[PDB]
């Protein structure tokens, strides 16, 4: 219900943003664990004969992993070479299938948010700086800041 990071990598194996929620206002330096978890999943693209992909129609939620306190996976659409991944904190994890398809559909919501901000020509040549802040500014309300809506 809350991701522990958000990571974005394009097709050249360059990480676009390894975003971590709440690194200010709360605990630091586990972001140093978070990006190397992302790099473990980056060179753990396909290894030791474990295949995540069998359906080529829509890229669904692929194989779950669990490593040293988090629960990560991958969702390779194979469309424009986008390789985005999401982990979850295992300490609050119920492990159901509506949870599993729920994180599948919120993975498609963050896919929607990236493909919306990918083609916003209100500012042009937004490719290096404050595109990142803008997409972080669109990240940080879809999973949190629901506390005052009621």
């Amino acid at each position: 219900l809350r991701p522990c990071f958000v990571s974005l990598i394009d097709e050249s194996d360059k990480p676009i943003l390894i975003y971590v929620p709440n690194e200010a206002e709360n605990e630091m330096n586990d972001v140093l664990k978070y990006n190397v978890l992302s790099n473990i999943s980056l060179d753990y693209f396909e290894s030791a004969l474990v295949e995540w992909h069998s359906l080529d129609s829509k890229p669904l939620l692929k194989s779950i992993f669990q490593l040293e306190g988090v629960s990560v996976f991958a969702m390779l659409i194979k469309q424009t070479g986008l390789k985005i991944v999401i982990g979850f904190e295992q300490k609050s994890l119920s492990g159901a299938d509506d949870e599993f398809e729920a994180i599948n559909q919120i993975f498609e919501t963050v896919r929607k948010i990236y493909i919306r901000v990918k083609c916003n020509p209100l500012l042009v040549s937004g490719d290096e700086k404050s595109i990142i802040k803008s997409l972080e500014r669109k990240f940080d309300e879809l999973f949190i800041s629901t506390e005052v809506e009621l």
């Binding site: 790099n39 060179d43 753990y44 030791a48």
Partner: peptide
């Protein structure tokens, strides 16, 4: 050749 764990 995965270069996955011992590369990290």
């Amino acid at each position: 050749k995965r270069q996955r764990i011992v590369d990290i």
